[PDB]
Amino acid sequence: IVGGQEAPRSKWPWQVSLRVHGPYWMHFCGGSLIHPQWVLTAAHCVGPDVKDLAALRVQLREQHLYYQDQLLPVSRIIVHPQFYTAQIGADIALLELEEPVKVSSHVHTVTLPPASETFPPGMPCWVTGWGDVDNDERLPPPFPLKQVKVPIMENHICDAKYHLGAYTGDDVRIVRDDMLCAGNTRRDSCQGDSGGPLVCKVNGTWLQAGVVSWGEGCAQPNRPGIYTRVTYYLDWIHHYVPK
Amino acid sequence: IVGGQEAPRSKWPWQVSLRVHGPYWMHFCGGSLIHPQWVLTAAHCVGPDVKDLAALRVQLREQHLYYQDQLLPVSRIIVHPQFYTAQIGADIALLELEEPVKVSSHVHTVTLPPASETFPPGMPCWVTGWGDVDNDERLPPPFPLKQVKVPIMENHICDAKYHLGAYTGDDVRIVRDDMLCAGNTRRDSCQGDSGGPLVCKVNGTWLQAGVVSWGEGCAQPNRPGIYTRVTYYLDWIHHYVPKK
Amino acid sequence: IVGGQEAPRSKWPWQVSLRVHGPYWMHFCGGSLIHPQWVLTAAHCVGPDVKDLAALRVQLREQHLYYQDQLLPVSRIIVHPQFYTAQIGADIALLELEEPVKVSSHVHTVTLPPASETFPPGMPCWVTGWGDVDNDERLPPPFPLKQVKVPIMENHICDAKYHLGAYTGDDVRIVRDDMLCAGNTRRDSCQGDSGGPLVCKVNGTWLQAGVVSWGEGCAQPNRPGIYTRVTYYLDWIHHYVPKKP
Amino acid sequence: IVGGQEAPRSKWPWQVSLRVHGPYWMHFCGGSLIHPQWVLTAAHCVGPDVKDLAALRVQLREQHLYYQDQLLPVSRIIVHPQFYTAQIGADIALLELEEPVKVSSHVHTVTLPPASETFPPGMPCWVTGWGDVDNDERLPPPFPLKQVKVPIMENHICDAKYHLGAYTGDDVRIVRDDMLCAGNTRRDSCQGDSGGPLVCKVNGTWLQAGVVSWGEGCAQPNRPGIYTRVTYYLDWIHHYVPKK
C-alpha cells in the first residue's frame, strides 16, 4: 500500500494473506473472505499455470504478518477459465478452504455488491494489504496491515490516462469493461497487495467493489491502480459460492 | 539464444543491437535492418510508454557486442497503435535512423515476405541475437552473436501446448493469428533476443518470418517461443518504410 | 545461529539487538547488557570508522525481532583503541545508553568472568542471536531469538585447524591469545550474531566468555567460530563501566 | 581504476589478468610479468586458503578483456607464508607459468627495484588494471585496460590519514612498514585492480614500487590506496625468481 497508514485492529476482518511454501510460508498476495469456506483473490496470484495445492496456505486477518500464524490448507483453486494475463482481464480466482472458518467480530466475511450496483466516480473506497509501500520498497517488519482511501474513477477517464505518454491508439482499450480504476500519485495499491479487496461503504454496508489486479508501477502519474470489477463476475462467483 | 552456436561473420548482415543510455550504452533488444534508414523491432522493447529518443542508439551487425561500437542516433520511434502487451499482440515497432546507412556484403537489409507466405512446419528457420544462453543465464563476454535453427510449429498446435498445465479454457486463444511459434526444449530465443529476427530461407532468399516477442521462460516444456508474424503487419510497415 | 533452537522466553535476559537507521531500524549486530547503562559488543559492528550516534539504537531482549520495539538512544560509542580488524584482534566495544534501563527477571545484566577463568574444553557454553541460520541464509520472519550449545576448543588446536588447507606458515599465529574458539560443522554463530554473547554456566552462574567476532564462513570444516576473549579486556571494560554498587 | 583513462596500446606490456573458471574465464585480479615464467600478484587474490591450479589461468596484456584471450596455465602458486590478511601484511604471491612467454615490444617483463631504492613522497607513479571505475561501479564493456597517475605518499602521513575519523589509537599502526601508499579522492586503484603493479619511472627505467593490496573503498577522503612494498620482499621474490 502506497501513502497508507497501519489499519486499526477492528478494521478489515475479511483481509487474508496467501502464503507460498519456501524457507518460510511467505506472503505473495492478498484475498478477501466472502464466505466461511471461500477466499476471493486475483487469478494472476495462482495462475494461469496450475500450482501444487500443498505449497499454498491462507492466513486470516493478522495485524502483523508472520507473528501469530495459523495457516489454513486450501482444498481447491478455481481460476476464471477466460484468464491468461491481468491486462487481457478475467483476473479473478476462488480458494475453497478445507474447513469453514468460525467467524467473529475480528474475523468475518465481506458483502459482495448486487449486479445493479454502480459505484459512482469520486466515491471514497479503501484498499488494504501487506504489499510494497512504494516502487521496489518492501513493507518493513513488523509488517503491519496497511489501508489507504482511494477515489473510484470512471473507466473511460482511467483508459484516457493510460493513453497519455503512450504510443497505444486512443481508440484501442487498455482499461476494459470487466476492470475498475482507483488511486493517484499519493495513494495506490502495489506489489504484494494483488488479490486484496477494494471496499466501499454503501448504506452502512462495506461492499467489495474490486480485486487488486494490475498497474504500471505504484502511484505513477496518469497510471492509477486497475482492479477486477466484482459486479462483472458475480454470476461466476455465485456458480461456486453459496448465497 | 538457447542451444545455439556463434554465428559465422558472413551470416545475418541485417542483425542490429538496440542500446539504452546508462553507465554504458547497454544492449536491451535486437532488431533487423529492413531499409538503409529503418530498423524493425518489437514494440515491447520501446513501448507502450513514450521514451526519450536521445537515450536510444542502434548498433549495426558486430561479431562481438561492445568491441567495435559505431552507435547511430534515431530520429523517430513508430510503435503499432494496437500494441499494449506482447500477449495481446501487435508487438512490432519501427526505428527511423537520422541518416541512411551505407550497405555492404557484411551489413545490409533483410527481405520481408510476401503476404501469402505462411511458413509451414518443416521450413528451415533461424533466430539470432546476443540474448541469454538459458533462463537467468547471461551471454558471457566477449558476447558473440549466436544463431539457432528452430522448428516452426502450427499456431493451433502451439495454442494447445500453452493450454497444457494451465487453468485457461481450451477455447480461449493464447497464441493469436498475428503470432508465429518456433523452438523446443533445446532450441529457443531468450531475454535480450526480443525484437530480433526469425528468418527462413525460401527459394534461395532469406525472408523475415518473425520478430522475437514473448514466451513462458526459454526452452520450457510445452512453451515454445512466440514471434510477431511479419506478414500480418506488412501494410502497416509499408505505410512508413519506402519500397526499394 | 547455525544448528540452534528458538530460545525459551525465560533465557538470555542480557541479549540486545543493535539497530541502524534506514527504511526501518534494521538489526545488524548483537550485544549484551553488562550494566543498566552499558552494552558490550564487537568493535567491527561500530568501527573502526566513527559513525553518527543518531543513526544507532539499542533494543533490549525481545523473543521476536521488530514485533515489540522500544528503541533506546546511545550517548557514547567506546571502541578499543587497538582495534582495526577482527583478525588482528581487540574486537570489543562499549555502548553507553542515554538512560539506565530498569532491570527485571526478563531483562537484566550478564556477569563478566574473573581474570583467572580460561573456559577449558568440555565446559557447557551457549551463543545466542538473530543472525543467519546458515551461510547466506537469513533468519526467516518472525525472527525468533536462537540459541546453540557450542563446544569450546583450545586456542592451539583451533590455530592448527585454521592452518589446514591454508598457505599461512604453521608458526604464523592466526587464532590470537585475546581470542576464544567454539563451534563445529553443526553448531556455530553466523552473520548478524556478531557482537552477541558466548556465555558459559560456571558454578551455577552464567559468565560471558566471548563476544562473537569472526570466522571463515559459518559451520565450515576446520573453521570454528572465533570470539573476543572477555577476560583479556576486563581492565579496559572496568575503565568505563562502574562495578556493581 | 578510479579517475583513470584507457591505456595506450604501447604502454604497460607487463600487465596480466588472473582468470577463475566459471560460466567463463572471469577476471578477478591483476598481476605483473617480472620474468618470462613468473607473475607477481597479491596473496589475497589466491589465498590464504589453498586453491585448485586447474581453475586458474593467466592472460597477458590485452587492450580489451576477453576479446582475444590466449589463456596460460599456472604450474605453481607461491603465497608468502606470513600472509593471512592484507591489513596484517605480506600481501604478495608468485605464479609460476607452465611455459616461459616469448617476449616482444608489446609483451615483456617489468624491472624490480634494488633493495636500496626509496621512491620519495610526491614521485609520479602509475597504477593500471581492469578494476572498478568507482565504489560498486564495474568497468563497462568492452573492458579497456585503464591507467592513472598517483603520487607516492610517506607511510607516516598515510597511517595518520587512516586514523582521521577512526577510533583506532594514533600510536596503533594501520599502514605497516611492508606497505606503500598512493592516491587521492580523484585517483585510486579499486576492486579488480588487486595484485596489479604500481610502477614509477626512475632514470629512464620503469620500476615496480608496489602491488595493489587494500584500502577503505576507492578514492574515499583520508583513505589512500595501500600497496605491498616490493623492496620489502625482494629477497623472498629472488628466492624463487631468477635475476636478470
PDB file of N, CA, C and O in Angstrom, chain A residues 4-29:
ATOM      1  N   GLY A   4      -0.423   4.935   2.611  1.00  0.00           N
ATOM      2  CA  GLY A   4      -1.410   4.428   3.573  1.00  0.00           C
ATOM      3  C   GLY A   4      -0.965   4.666   5.002  1.00  0.00           C
ATOM      4  O   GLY A   4       0.081   5.317   5.215  1.00  0.00           O
ATOM      5  N   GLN A   5      -1.748   4.152   5.946  1.00  0.00           N
ATOM      6  CA  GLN A   5      -1.420   4.065   7.388  1.00  0.00           C
ATOM      7  C   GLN A   5      -1.685   2.634   7.847  1.00  0.00           C
ATOM      8  O   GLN A   5      -2.383   1.909   7.115  1.00  0.00           O
ATOM      9  N   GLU A   6      -1.148   2.259   9.005  1.00  0.00           N
ATOM     10  CA  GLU A   6      -1.455   0.967   9.671  1.00  0.00           C
ATOM     11  C   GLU A   6      -2.959   0.944   9.956  1.00  0.00           C
ATOM     12  O   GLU A   6      -3.487   1.966  10.439  1.00  0.00           O
ATOM     13  N   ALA A   7      -3.625  -0.161   9.617  1.00  0.00           N
ATOM     14  CA  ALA A   7      -5.062  -0.390   9.886  1.00  0.00           C
ATOM     15  C   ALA A   7      -5.271  -0.512  11.393  1.00  0.00           C
ATOM     16  O   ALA A   7      -4.466  -1.151  12.066  1.00  0.00           O
ATOM     17  N   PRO A   8      -6.344   0.071  11.977  1.00  0.00           N
ATOM     18  CA  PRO A   8      -6.766  -0.313  13.324  1.00  0.00           C
ATOM     19  C   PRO A   8      -7.124  -1.807  13.366  1.00  0.00           C
ATOM     20  O   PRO A   8      -7.599  -2.331  12.358  1.00  0.00           O
ATOM     21  N   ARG A   9      -6.902  -2.444  14.521  1.00  0.00           N
ATOM     22  CA  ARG A   9      -7.144  -3.893  14.776  1.00  0.00           C
ATOM     23  C   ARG A   9      -8.595  -4.283  14.456  1.00  0.00           C
ATOM     24  O   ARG A   9      -8.799  -5.443  14.054  1.00  0.00           O
ATOM     25  N   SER A  10      -9.562  -3.376  14.646  1.00  0.00           N
ATOM     26  CA  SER A  10     -11.017  -3.641  14.454  1.00  0.00           C
ATOM     27  C   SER A  10     -11.413  -3.617  12.970  1.00  0.00           C
ATOM     28  O   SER A  10     -12.507  -4.126  12.671  1.00  0.00           O
ATOM     29  N   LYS A  11     -10.575  -3.074  12.073  1.00  0.00           N
ATOM     30  CA  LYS A  11     -10.941  -2.821  10.651  1.00  0.00           C
ATOM     31  C   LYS A  11     -10.506  -3.989   9.758  1.00  0.00           C
ATOM     32  O   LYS A  11      -9.472  -4.622  10.051  1.00  0.00           O
ATOM     33  N   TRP A  12     -11.279  -4.233   8.696  1.00  0.00           N
ATOM     34  CA  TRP A  12     -10.985  -5.170   7.578  1.00  0.00           C
ATOM     35  C   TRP A  12     -10.884  -6.607   8.092  1.00  0.00           C
ATOM     36  O   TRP A  12      -9.863  -7.268   7.904  1.00  0.00           O
ATOM     37  N   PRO A  13     -11.936  -7.146   8.753  1.00  0.00           N
ATOM     38  CA  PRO A  13     -11.899  -8.512   9.289  1.00  0.00           C
ATOM     39  C   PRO A  13     -11.915  -9.630   8.228  1.00  0.00           C
ATOM     40  O   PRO A  13     -11.739 -10.787   8.591  1.00  0.00           O
ATOM     41  N   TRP A  14     -12.083  -9.264   6.953  1.00  0.00           N
ATOM     42  CA  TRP A  14     -12.150 -10.177   5.775  1.00  0.00           C
ATOM     43  C   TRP A  14     -10.790 -10.289   5.067  1.00  0.00           C
ATOM     44  O   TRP A  14     -10.665 -11.187   4.207  1.00  0.00           O
ATOM     45  N   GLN A  15      -9.822  -9.411   5.368  1.00  0.00           N
ATOM     46  CA  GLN A  15      -8.475  -9.410   4.723  1.00  0.00           C
ATOM     47  C   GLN A  15      -7.790 -10.746   5.027  1.00  0.00           C
ATOM     48  O   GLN A  15      -7.806 -11.150   6.207  1.00  0.00           O
ATOM     49  N   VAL A  16      -7.253 -11.418   4.002  1.00  0.00           N
ATOM     50  CA  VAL A  16      -6.428 -12.650   4.181  1.00  0.00           C
ATOM     51  C   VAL A  16      -5.090 -12.453   3.459  1.00  0.00           C
ATOM     52  O   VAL A  16      -5.009 -11.596   2.564  1.00  0.00           O
ATOM     53  N   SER A  17      -4.083 -13.206   3.896  1.00  0.00           N
ATOM     54  CA  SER A  17      -2.731 -13.306   3.300  1.00  0.00           C
ATOM     55  C   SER A  17      -2.598 -14.690   2.651  1.00  0.00           C
ATOM     56  O   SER A  17      -2.936 -15.679   3.323  1.00  0.00           O
ATOM     57  N   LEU A  18      -2.157 -14.757   1.392  1.00  0.00           N
ATOM     58  CA  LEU A  18      -1.836 -16.032   0.697  1.00  0.00           C
ATOM     59  C   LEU A  18      -0.348 -16.308   0.901  1.00  0.00           C
ATOM     60  O   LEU A  18       0.455 -15.381   0.687  1.00  0.00           O
ATOM     61  N   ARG A  19      -0.010 -17.545   1.272  1.00  0.00           N
ATOM     62  CA  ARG A  19       1.364 -17.962   1.642  1.00  0.00           C
ATOM     63  C   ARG A  19       1.816 -19.089   0.718  1.00  0.00           C
ATOM     64  O   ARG A  19       1.007 -20.001   0.445  1.00  0.00           O
ATOM     65  N   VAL A  20       3.062 -18.994   0.251  1.00  0.00           N
ATOM     66  CA  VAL A  20       3.724 -19.986  -0.644  1.00  0.00           C
ATOM     67  C   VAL A  20       4.825 -20.677   0.168  1.00  0.00           C
ATOM     68  O   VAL A  20       5.522 -19.978   0.936  1.00  0.00           O
ATOM     69  N   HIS A  21       4.969 -21.996   0.007  1.00  0.00           N
ATOM     70  CA  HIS A  21       5.980 -22.819   0.725  1.00  0.00           C
ATOM     71  C   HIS A  21       7.381 -22.448   0.229  1.00  0.00           C
ATOM     72  O   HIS A  21       7.579 -22.403  -0.990  1.00  0.00           O
ATOM     73  N   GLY A  22       8.302 -22.183   1.152  1.00  0.00           N
ATOM     74  CA  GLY A  22       9.733 -21.977   0.859  1.00  0.00           C
ATOM     75  C   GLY A  22      10.562 -22.155   2.125  1.00  0.00           C
ATOM     76  O   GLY A  22      10.212 -22.978   2.970  1.00  0.00           O
ATOM     77  N   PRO A  23      11.669 -21.397   2.297  1.00  0.00           N
ATOM     78  CA  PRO A  23      12.358 -21.311   3.588  1.00  0.00           C
ATOM     79  C   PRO A  23      11.398 -20.991   4.744  1.00  0.00           C
ATOM     80  O   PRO A  23      11.611 -21.479   5.845  1.00  0.00           O
ATOM     81  N   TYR A  24      10.375 -20.172   4.469  1.00  0.00           N
ATOM     82  CA  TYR A  24       9.196 -19.938   5.342  1.00  0.00           C
ATOM     83  C   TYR A  24       7.938 -19.772   4.474  1.00  0.00           C
ATOM     84  O   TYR A  24       8.052 -19.715   3.240  1.00  0.00           O
ATOM     85  N   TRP A  25       6.770 -19.720   5.115  1.00  0.00           N
ATOM     86  CA  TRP A  25       5.455 -19.529   4.450  1.00  0.00           C
ATOM     87  C   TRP A  25       5.290 -18.044   4.136  1.00  0.00           C
ATOM     88  O   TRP A  25       4.738 -17.315   4.970  1.00  0.00           O
ATOM     89  N   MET A  26       5.782 -17.635   2.967  1.00  0.00           N
ATOM     90  CA  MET A  26       5.957 -16.216   2.581  1.00  0.00           C
ATOM     91  C   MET A  26       4.655 -15.681   1.971  1.00  0.00           C
ATOM     92  O   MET A  26       4.069 -16.361   1.114  1.00  0.00           O
ATOM     93  N   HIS A  27       4.244 -14.492   2.404  1.00  0.00           N
ATOM     94  CA  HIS A  27       3.180 -13.674   1.775  1.00  0.00           C
ATOM     95  C   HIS A  27       3.584 -13.340   0.334  1.00  0.00           C
ATOM     96  O   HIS A  27       4.709 -12.850   0.140  1.00  0.00           O
ATOM     97  N   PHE A  28       2.710 -13.624  -0.635  1.00  0.00           N
ATOM     98  CA  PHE A  28       2.861 -13.218  -2.059  1.00  0.00           C
ATOM     99  C   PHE A  28       1.640 -12.417  -2.548  1.00  0.00           C
ATOM    100  O   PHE A  28       1.821 -11.618  -3.477  1.00  0.00           O
ATOM    101  N   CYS A  29       0.443 -12.614  -1.984  1.00  0.00           N
ATOM    102  CA  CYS A  29      -0.811 -11.964  -2.463  1.00  0.00           C
ATOM    103  C   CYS A  29      -1.825 -11.838  -1.323  1.00  0.00           C
ATOM    104  O   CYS A  29      -1.715 -12.569  -0.330  1.00  0.00           O
TER     105      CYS A  29
END
